[PDB]
Motif scaffolding. Structure first.
Motif, mmCIF file in Angstrom:
data_model
loop_
_atom_site.group_PDB
_atom_site.id
_atom_site.type_symbol
_atom_site.label_atom_id
_atom_site.label_comp_id
_atom_site.label_asym_id
_atom_site.label_seq_id
_atom_site.Cartn_x
_atom_site.Cartn_y
_atom_site.Cartn_z
ATOM 1 N N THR A 114 -101.172 -48.580 -22.405
ATOM 2 C CA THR A 114 -100.488 -47.396 -21.927
ATOM 3 C C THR A 114 -99.163 -47.275 -22.650
ATOM 4 O O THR A 114 -98.303 -48.146 -22.482
ATOM 5 C CB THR A 114 -100.260 -47.460 -20.429
ATOM 6 O OG1 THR A 114 -101.507 -47.649 -19.762
ATOM 7 C CG2 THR A 114 -99.658 -46.164 -19.964
ATOM 8 N N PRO A 115 -98.952 -46.251 -23.442
ATOM 9 C CA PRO A 115 -97.732 -46.185 -24.259
ATOM 10 C C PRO A 115 -96.526 -45.679 -23.481
ATOM 11 O O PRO A 115 -96.058 -44.562 -23.662
ATOM 12 C CB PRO A 115 -98.147 -45.230 -25.377
ATOM 13 C CG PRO A 115 -99.123 -44.343 -24.744
ATOM 14 C CD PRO A 115 -99.878 -45.154 -23.750
ATOM 15 N N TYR A 116 -96.011 -46.512 -22.586
ATOM 16 C CA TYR A 116 -94.749 -46.198 -21.938
ATOM 17 C C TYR A 116 -93.638 -46.233 -22.972
ATOM 18 O O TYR A 116 -93.652 -47.066 -23.877
ATOM 19 C CB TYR A 116 -94.444 -47.183 -20.816
ATOM 20 C CG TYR A 116 -95.429 -47.158 -19.678
ATOM 21 C CD1 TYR A 116 -95.482 -46.085 -18.809
ATOM 22 C CD2 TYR A 116 -96.268 -48.231 -19.444
ATOM 23 C CE1 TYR A 116 -96.369 -46.063 -17.769
ATOM 24 C CE2 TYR A 116 -97.153 -48.221 -18.398
ATOM 25 C CZ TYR A 116 -97.198 -47.133 -17.566
ATOM 26 O OH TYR A 116 -98.081 -47.114 -16.524
ATOM 27 N N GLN A 121 -93.310 -59.530 -27.318
ATOM 28 C CA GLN A 121 -92.895 -58.361 -28.080
ATOM 29 C C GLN A 121 -92.573 -57.189 -27.168
ATOM 30 O O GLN A 121 -91.595 -56.474 -27.399
ATOM 31 C CB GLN A 121 -93.972 -57.965 -29.079
ATOM 32 C CG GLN A 121 -93.530 -56.838 -29.954
ATOM 33 C CD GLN A 121 -94.566 -56.391 -30.926
ATOM 34 O OE1 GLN A 121 -95.677 -56.899 -30.956
ATOM 35 N NE2 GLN A 121 -94.213 -55.419 -31.730
ATOM 36 N N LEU A 122 -93.376 -56.989 -26.122
ATOM 37 C CA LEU A 122 -93.119 -55.919 -25.166
ATOM 38 C C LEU A 122 -91.816 -56.133 -24.415
ATOM 39 O O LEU A 122 -91.161 -55.165 -24.026
ATOM 40 C CB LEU A 122 -94.278 -55.815 -24.181
ATOM 41 C CG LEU A 122 -95.616 -55.323 -24.710
ATOM 42 C CD1 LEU A 122 -96.677 -55.545 -23.677
ATOM 43 C CD2 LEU A 122 -95.531 -53.865 -25.054
ATOM 44 N N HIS A 131 -88.126 -49.484 -27.527
ATOM 45 C CA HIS A 131 -88.823 -48.216 -27.644
ATOM 46 C C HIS A 131 -90.246 -48.471 -28.093
ATOM 47 O O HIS A 131 -90.513 -49.433 -28.805
ATOM 48 C CB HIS A 131 -88.139 -47.297 -28.641
ATOM 49 C CG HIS A 131 -86.799 -46.813 -28.199
ATOM 50 N ND1 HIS A 131 -85.657 -47.570 -28.330
ATOM 51 C CD2 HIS A 131 -86.412 -45.633 -27.668
ATOM 52 C CE1 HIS A 131 -84.627 -46.888 -27.868
ATOM 53 N NE2 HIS A 131 -85.057 -45.707 -27.465
ATOM 54 N N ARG A 132 -91.158 -47.590 -27.692
ATOM 55 C CA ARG A 132 -92.557 -47.796 -28.038
ATOM 56 C C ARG A 132 -92.839 -47.546 -29.510
ATOM 57 O O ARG A 132 -93.830 -48.064 -30.025
ATOM 58 C CB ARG A 132 -93.461 -46.904 -27.195
ATOM 59 C CG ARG A 132 -93.327 -45.442 -27.495
ATOM 60 C CD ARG A 132 -94.238 -44.602 -26.670
ATOM 61 N NE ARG A 132 -94.110 -43.203 -27.036
ATOM 62 C CZ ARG A 132 -94.798 -42.220 -26.479
ATOM 63 N NH1 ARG A 132 -95.668 -42.479 -25.521
ATOM 64 N NH2 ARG A 132 -94.615 -40.978 -26.883
#
Lengths: 408, 204
Positions: free
Chosen positions: B109-111, B148-149, B154-155
């Motif tokens: 999911t690209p939050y 990494q997350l 920023h995505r």
């Protein structure tokens, strides 16, 4: 035993812990706390480390902050427990001197045990006949019936320790809340005992699925699997692992799967009839009085020691009784059980308690019946004529795991 | 840091049994103890049972599970569990139990602020490339590690790592969301039980 639960929930002092500070909130409306002192204790797995007494001077509906001293920080393993009590030093018109009017317990810091077990040099010896697996280690000896799949007999020297094999138990002798208004003429089909009987929990037979025995480098590993079936429908599947190591300890791990469409079982645990009749029961857990998963707030975690007659609650209509929850260690005669379990221990089987209408018609059986539960259903009691066990105390998870260590 | 307490390997009549024990310690205080059992039988299946003890005074962990970085990058993820969309223990009422099949980009999911995402709860079977996992677990599967997350603001600054990061959780904390400026995970979704057990079967 429910009167102690009523006393604790109705107590006039409420307690809150924040670090080293205890705030004591009075729920009296009119009187100052002029006959009250707070006694606190810190214990590590039942043995006391620090204590003290503080006089309470709290206004009606007021608060009082109690700063504890620098509490001891033992590097020994175990959970540290803080217990406070409100004691009335002076007699009143209605109470004696030293009357305890309120209490509360909290968990402080825990040290997890990272100590390796002592590597003994002995090895238990596995002997396989076609009737049994026999494991001997010193004077101790364990026998597993290969047709039933259960541990059928244990020896210390030449004394048999069991009268009945160690078997899974998924039922309890039904409480008055389990029965409701159901009788033999008018079945109430919503009552828990009628759902358990219609699903066949009281008459499901164990069927051995597999049984293996293996010798490890330092232990003997016995692995069994049973299914409880009623009219072709599998109710429960239990998969066990018995690990007898060189120290004589038997570690039991139990994995139970419950069918989602059967009504949720009253308990998930083991029972056996010990041959020993000892006079006192010693346990590290919640007590002293009997307590259940939805009736345990009044019980305190400590080392408790009672005679065996105090482990039975003589309800006039006999039922399941005497359970102690939150138990980490149980001592009875030569035996010791460890884990995190619920137990009750009595001279009456669950079958006898179910079939007997009055407590004066109960006869003590030979030996001692032990039930050890990993999981136990709540007892309910919002009313006694409809199902009143709330959903967070029903055994509805579908898969259950618990571990025991039997030793001497 | 994990510290190996013991490791044993034994041959059974029909399987190989590997038994390990680790402790997670921070400044002399043991936070977690994990005891595992690996059972490779003759069918090629590896049954993993994990028993975790959590210290009661540490804050409750966000998850209890396993991770690995697979070398495979497959194009589609197939699972029998709740889905299709990502769901969490306190946000799973909308998900349906079925056989779901999505591309690997739909499992992320690209939050815009990157975080934990893509978890699927209630999963009984997971298929990814040649591998199959079975049990009752939560998983997420992506090209981005949890490290990494955590460190990326920023995505658009996320880069796909080599291979595929798989997290398989026996237990996962709720996400909360009554508000986002005070702790809002309710007590029935915190991992507060102290002892945890879960089982996996890895096979091909």
């Amino acid at each position: 035993p429910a009167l102690t639960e009523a006393k604790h929930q109705q107590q006039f002092f409420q307690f809150r812990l924040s670090g080293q500070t205890i705030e004591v909130t009075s729920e009296y409306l009119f009187r100052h706390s002029d006959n009250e002192l707070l006694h606190w204790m810190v214990a590590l797995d039942g043995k006391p480390l620090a204590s003290g007494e503080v006089p309470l001077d709290v206004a009606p509906q007021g608060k009082q902050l109690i700063e504890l001293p620098e509490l001891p920080q033992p590097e020994s393993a175990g959970q540290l427990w803080l217990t406070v009590r409100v004691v009335q030093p002076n007699a009143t018109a209605w109470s004696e001197a030293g009357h305890i009017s309120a209490w509360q317990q909290w968990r402080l810091a825990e040290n997890l045990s990272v100590t390796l077990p002592a590597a003994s040099h002995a090895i238990p010896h596995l002997t396989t006949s076609e009737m049994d697996f026999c494991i001997e280690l010193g004077n101790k000896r364990w026998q597993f019936n290969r047709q039933s799949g259960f541990l059928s007999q244990m020896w210390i020297g030449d004394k048999k320790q069991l009268l009945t094999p160690l078997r899974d138990q998924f039922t309890r002798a039904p409480l008055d809340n389990d029965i409701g208004v159901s009788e033999a003429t008018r079945i109430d089909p919503n009552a828990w005992v009628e759902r358990w009987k219609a699903a066949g929990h009281y008459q499901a037979e164990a069927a051995l699925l597999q049984c293996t025995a293996d010798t490890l480098a330092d232990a003997v590993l016995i692995t069994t699997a049973h299914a409880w079936q009623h009219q072709g429908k599998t109710l429960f599947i239990s998969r066990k692992t018995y690990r007898i190591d060189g120290s004589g300890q038997m570690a039991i791990t139990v994995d139970v799967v419950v069918a989602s469409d059967t009504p949720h079982p009253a308990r998930i645990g083991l029972n056996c009839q010990l041959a020993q009749v000892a006079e006192r029961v010693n346990w590290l857990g919640l007590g002293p009085q009997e307590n259940y998963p939805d009736r345990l707030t009044a019980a305190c975690f400590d080392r408790w020691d009672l005679p065996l007659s105090d482990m039975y609650t003589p309800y006039v209509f006999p039922s399941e009784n005497g359970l102690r929850c939150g138990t980490r260690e149980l001592n009875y005669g030569p035996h010791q059980w460890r884990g995190d379990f619920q137990f009750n221990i009595s001279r009456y089987s669950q079958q006898q308690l179910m079939e007997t209408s009055h407590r004066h018609l109960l006869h003590a059986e030979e030996g001692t019946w032990l039930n050890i539960d990993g999981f136990h259903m709540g007892i309910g009691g919002d009313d006694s004529w409809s199902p009143s066990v709330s959903a967070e105390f029903q055994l509805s998870a579908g898969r259950y795991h618990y571990q025991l260590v039997w030793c001497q």
